[PDB]
Amino acid sequence: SELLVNTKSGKVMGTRVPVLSSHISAFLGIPFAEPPVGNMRFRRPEPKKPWSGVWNASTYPNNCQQYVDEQFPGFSGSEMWNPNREMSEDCLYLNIWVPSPRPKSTTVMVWIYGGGFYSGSSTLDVYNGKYLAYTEEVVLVSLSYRVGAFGFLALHGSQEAPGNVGLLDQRMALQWVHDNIQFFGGDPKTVTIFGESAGGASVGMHILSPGSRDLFRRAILQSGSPNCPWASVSVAEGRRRAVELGRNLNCNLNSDEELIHCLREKKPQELIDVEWNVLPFDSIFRFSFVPVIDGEFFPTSLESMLNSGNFKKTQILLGVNKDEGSFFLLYGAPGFSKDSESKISREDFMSGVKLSVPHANDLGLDAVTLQYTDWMDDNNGIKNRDGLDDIVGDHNVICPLMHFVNKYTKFGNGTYLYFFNHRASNLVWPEWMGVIHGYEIEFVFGLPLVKELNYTAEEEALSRRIMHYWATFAKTGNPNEPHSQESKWPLFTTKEQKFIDLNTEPMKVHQRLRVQMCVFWNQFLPKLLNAT
Template sequence: MLSYGSEGLFHSVAAMSGSELSYHQVITNTMLAYNNTVKLGRQVGCTQQVGADIWDCLLTRSPNDLIEGVQNMLVEFNRYAFLPVIDGNFLRESPEVLLKRKEVLSPVPYLTGVNRNDGTEVLLSERDLARVNFIIDRPFLEYKIMDFVLKKNFTTNREAALQAIKHLYTFWPDLQNNDKTRQEFIHFATDAYYVAPVSKSAQLHSESGSIVYMYVNNYNFSTGAPNGERFFPAWMGVCHDCDLYLLFGFPWMPKEFLPQNLRSVLWTDTDKNVSDTFMSMWKQFARRNNPNLLRENIWINYGPRDRYYLNINVTRTLHQDYEWEHVGFWNIYIGTLYDLYTTTFSPTEASLRKELVGFKATTGIFIILCAATLTCAGTLLYLHSIYKRNRPVSVHYS
């Protein structure tokens, strides 16, 4: 939608549990991408000094070597070391800049949304926690929030931003309740990585001329499972992939086509009904650019001021302003507590910055010396005038 190269090549877009504005979806600083490539080279024995030579060396390494090298890298900024990069060709500017300028070359209908507990994937990525059933305590939550703040590169007033996030996602009635702490962590990850950027993207796309439809998937497969059997732990709720299970018809699919871990699942009739409705809505969007089922009009598009979204569960209901307090916290309030400042510069920019600092320092010293000289000269002139005024006049008599 934002690239000159793809203008006119498609007629609609669906972005599920993802946004071009999520900080873990794109790298906007090319020097950060370059630095990460140099780090990867060091991990796999490519220690050349020239970028082109490092790249040629990386091409000689096996995929397994590269994967192992990435896993062993220390990621200082962003969630992942390697993401799509704003190179100035495919995209001229960062997605947020283009959207705010309303430079959307293909403002086609845009369908987006989240699962209620998308943040479970962040917790599941902590594989070491599997042995304790992903139970976490308050120190772990605080550590992950600090890690988020550092990797997001909050440089100004970092402590205020850190304390604000910790305050919002602390279960104050019982600080020692690990189950509630885990829920708060999932809430934090869902808001920071998914809800806030998806909501911001929907807002900016709507303001830029696209017809936007937003949904929130609230259907929990574990609810109403036969004999109370759950194929997801209860704490996962509506997981990160749950909308994909509905969209691709997992409840209808022959077991041999399902992922290995889902072949023993006993899908209910409710699962099948919700999946059928989900698939039908997406089919209508692909055909008519409108996800409403035939002879229905319950899903009103997301507007810049009314912000409608469809709550998808056993039944479907229309609401406004999803998680507005937390969306406002991440998209507006937190930005007042810090300035996002990039610490990596190109050699040319770094040289110009040094010259600018030197010029400012020299100019400042020159101005101070001039002021001191003028002050001294003025003082001497003033004293000289007083001396001349008070000097005794001698009278000569002939």
């Protein structure tokens, strides 16, 4: 049967699903690890023990335990990111969408969801891989991994809670794909891992980590890179936060043994209820439990690795959205509201700057403020709001990605850069937020092809182009069709640094994406903070 597959872990039974008036096979909720529960909480994952009989893979699995956004109850804009399944620590599963008839050896794409390492689900409607699998004829896989304290609590030196276990979950899933995707018609030697935000950072982390490199062929990074200021912490800061977490739950802190034991006795929601209390600074775009530079998963500092070419050399495709910062300002900066234009005063502007660059001394804050202020019109509410939006996006997403791309490109085999600036016609978020963090995802997964979702004809066209770029890149290492007559997406080189815009207008090639600001965030500010 087309829905029956015998893998190395056992047999699996999928289900037939309708898609754009046709059908494809879906294998949902396939386990790739032993349930990380009880004494296994915080530990590295262990391979799923093979099973007898047939595993029923017709329904989505549970979502990993996580903080749930209740800022706007009932609002689709925010609830579309919340878990849509029961939460459980027993959540290490993967999903596979296979074309019909089942291929023999076709290109594979593995999606790694984002969510700031503190949230995320492989089961969201926006991640439904059936459209992409069907349209581009690829085997689409979406994995899952532990988030929050569950996946990143880090007490370096201890083997009970070493940290980075969430990244190891991802790796274990990639290992399963490498070992079993051939039975689903996928080519294990042609897998492209791709992800957004924390997922994009994760992809970059696997490119860097010696232990992950051999498990995939190519990579795509959307709005995220390994070197993002929020993507990782030192073992010292990791340790400090783990201890403070224990302190919030009145745990014995005399030893790692007692802290870890005390934390493993807590219900999941108990850890989640105090998760945010361990941040060192009053900040925005900063998350509690994230990857840690441990000297194991990451041999040395990310910067030294990028400088010496200590990473997988292959082709990469990556980019960012025009307004990455608006989401974080709406949720935590004074002056911003979902239902107002959020025109910002000078007061709130400087308050926002302090929140956006928490690690900066006064001189640093002044440098940022000057860099983003138009002194011929400093009380312009719209300029202050947009200036703040740019600061958050440049510092947290764009400039770090540009640093990565430039460092990677010196040793890589091919780079393709994009700048997504189309605001969906059916967005429910206010206009001031612009092209929001994460909203290019729906175009990548082809939601605009479904009439009932209410996108325009140009947005369907844009979605098909993007899906085809992504899949052709996954297949060949070049998003462009060899003999196409269509406009060509140029290769990003150290010299020209070309990139293209991604919207419904005719392709436009540019150069040096936000260089002016990035030189500020990547060269000057760091120098200033280190000297003062």
